[PDB]
Amino acid sequence: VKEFLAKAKEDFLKKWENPAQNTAHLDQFERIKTLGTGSFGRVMLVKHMETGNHYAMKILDKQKVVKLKQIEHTLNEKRILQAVNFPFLVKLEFSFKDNSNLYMVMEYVPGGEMFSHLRRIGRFSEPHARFYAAQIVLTFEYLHSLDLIYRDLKPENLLIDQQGYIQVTDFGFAKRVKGRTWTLCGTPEYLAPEIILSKGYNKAVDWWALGVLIYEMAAGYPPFFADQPIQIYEKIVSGKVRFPSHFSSDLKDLLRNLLQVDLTKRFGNLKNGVNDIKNHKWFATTDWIAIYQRKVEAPFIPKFKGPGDTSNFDDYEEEEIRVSINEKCGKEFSEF
Amino acid sequence: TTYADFIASGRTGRRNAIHD
Ligand SMILES: N[C@H](COc1cncc(-c2ccc3[nH]ncc3c2)c1)CC1=C2C=CC=CC2N=C1
User: Fold this and answer.
1) Is A244 exposed, middle or buried, given 0-12, 13-18 or 19+ CB atoms closer than 10 A?
2) CATH architecture for residues A1-18+113-303
């Protein structure tokens, strides 16, 4: 572990300090289909003519990124993504920008979002949830070892690749920080109490999120839900959680510690670090080495009739990609 | 059942991130 990290941190640091820029152009890609949309940009399936490879291209509207004050966050996402490298993080292949947009081309995951399979199936068996949680556990140990905080863990951001393993996406809130940070961001159902009460938080918010995920993966629903955000936040800070009758005793115990409103006793942020999680009962059956190598039996293998298949993704209206004749936000995004 | 309350709630679709 420590042997592995050390070297990994050295490869990251090099890239971190000298990020690669403009490694492609729009006209080298064939637009195929929008795979998701929202906030200030969208993600499209795309084909690279030189290699004939398919990629997921995230296009961000520079002007919209500015109206939503996400400039630094956006710079955080690309700089971090171009420098990291782990089996459960989706790979950033190319990045560039034009007059109107920012573009990040990444590896296309035909398998779709965990969210979709999770909602369709209802809930995962514990051995199934454990298999996915373990992968997240290792990704956070990797990330945190690099001083990175993820901040938006959820089924919607986890894709299943061809081997049934998870690929984390969306580094919009990722940030390299040593010490306390205060930015209010994330998704309601997953916000640590620290964030909602806006009291300066650290990596511990990621571990709390892992606790919400495991519960949702196993129960079929979030440990804290309601129609309006405010209602949800009152639940998160109450220090009250209920577990379906089917949750094993170890599973209940693991979650009690993970969903610990007392961030000075919450597993992961303790003296023993990630080992308080990796050496927990519910994980005793987990071969942590095996999982990193991907030699463990994947509980579910998504299906695709071929490369470029988008049946595992919903459909969205297809707007057009427009690049103004004038540069829009040069200075704000010069390092991208 | 909670599962029933969840499925009937307006929060079963993709949840948007928040910031400002
Ligand atoms: N979080 C959801 C998903 O987001 C993602 C973000 N960024 C890359 C990906 C991605 C990366 C790699 C990949 N290979 N196959 C599919 C695929 C997808 C997904 C929806 C949401 C947004 C979608 C678009 C823009 C802004 C968004 N803000 C929220």
Assistant:
1) middle
2) Orthogonal Bundle (1.10)
